[PDB]
Design a binder for this molecule. Structure first.
Ligand SMILES: CCCCNC(=O)C#Cc1cc(C2=NN(C3CCCCCC3)C(=O)[C@@H]3CCCC[C@H]23)ccc1OC
Ligand SMILES: [Mg+2]
Ligand SMILES: [Zn+2]
Length: 333
């Protein structure tokens, strides 16, 4: 990991994001990416602005300089894939800011936990290649064999954590260098637990654990905090369908293309290709999004808002209205 240059930091700091309000639930990262022809420097500057405006990095002895080095060390390790690129993790960072500060989830966590979550957003998909865990295991690829041999089925999520500790091992990009003892430990353990919890194979059990804890007034408090962090990172990670319809739609286009590519390589490798990943099945976006809404996103957001995160009710309202709009695309076809 080469150190970040004064020139690179300057390239970010110049961005001023005219009109954009990065703290708003109606914020639009697509409009932001076009507004210039340096769409990466913009993304970095949104992330930088979000982290400073929280007032958290300052409280934990993280200089403006170390914070920007971190953001740029993260950006270098993301790839040119349709969805799991740098724009996705800047989106998860911004969305998590809104859940914390507009949804009042900050009230459930310490400032350190709020700081860790915003930072974890940016590392949670490092060096994602546009292929899911299943691909690595079905093709008996090296990373797949190593996961299988060492007993951890979360191929990508363990990879992401490995790159996250690498970046933070250098004091010039360690946003946690200001921490010591129990606080530094908590920052690393909670960042790692949250990234590992983004594996959708654990979706059901993470959701049921958080709900059983929130329903139990005698839950261990440290455990409830941890599961709140995991649930918020998960929330941001499937937050596409909580955005204004046209934003939601562009995200659904980017993820469908990434899936389609995986199925193109699964084809040329002679491995099982699910309907979802098959360009030849040419399924309607509308039916896809309605499916995701009915089986994953609507139950998830409704249950966590009912159980505990009442201030996030708008996510359930926007899902409800996004589903209505896709039902009208169908009704008028
Ligand atoms: C049954 C739905 C049909 C799919 N068609 C669609 O229109 C769509 C979509 C879509 C999908 C994802 C992700 N999907 N999933 C798994 C979720 C569990 C159900 C099925 C297995 C995939 C993952 O693991 C990714 C990695 C982690 C998080 C979610 C993401 C994110 C955003 C999306 O829309 C913007
Ligand atoms: Mg991921
Ligand atoms: Zn993600």
């Amino acid at each position: 990991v080469t150190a970040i240059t004064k020139v690179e930091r300057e390239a970010v700091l110049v961005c001023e994001l005219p009109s954009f309000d990065v703290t708003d639930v109606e914020f639009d990262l697509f409009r932001a990416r076009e507004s210039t022809d340096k769409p990466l420097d913009v993304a970095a500057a949104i992330a930088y602005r979000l982290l400073l405006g929280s007032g958290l990095p300052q409280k934990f002895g993280c200089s403006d300089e170390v914070l920007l080095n971190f953001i740029l060390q993260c950006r270098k390790k993301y790839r040119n894939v349709p969805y799991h690129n740098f724009y996705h993790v800047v989106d998860v960072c911004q969305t998590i800011h809104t859940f914390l500060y507009r949804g009042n989830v900050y009230e459930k966590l310490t400032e350190l936990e709020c700081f860790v979550l915003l930072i974890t957003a940016l590392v949670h998909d490092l060096d994602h290649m546009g292929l899911n865990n299943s691909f690595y295991l079905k093709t008996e690829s090296p990373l797949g064999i190593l996961s299988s041999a060492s007993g951890n089925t979360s191929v990508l999520e363990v990879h992401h954590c490995n790159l996250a500790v690498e970046i933070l091992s250098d004091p010039e990009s360690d946003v946690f260098d200001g921490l010591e003892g129990a606080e530094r430990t908590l920052a690393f353990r909670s960042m790692i637990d949250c990234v590992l919890a983004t594996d959708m194979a654990k979706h059901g059990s993470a959701l049921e654990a958080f709900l059983a804890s929130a329903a139990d007034q005698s839950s261990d408090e440290a455990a409830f905090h941890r599961m709140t962090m995991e649930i918020i990172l998960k929330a941001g990670d499937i937050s596409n369908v909580t955005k204004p319809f046209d934003i939601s739609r562009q995200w659904a286009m980017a993820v469908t293309e990434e899936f389609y590519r995986q199925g193109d390589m699964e084809k040329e490798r002679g491995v099982e290709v699910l309907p979802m990943f098959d360009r030849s099945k040419n399924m309607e976006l509308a039916k896809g999004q309605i499916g995701f809404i009915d089986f994953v996103a609507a139950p998830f957001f409704q249950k966590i808002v009912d159980a505990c995160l009442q201030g996030m009710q708008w996510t359930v309202d926007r899902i409800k209205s996004n589903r209505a709009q896709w039902e009208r695309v169908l009704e008028t076809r």
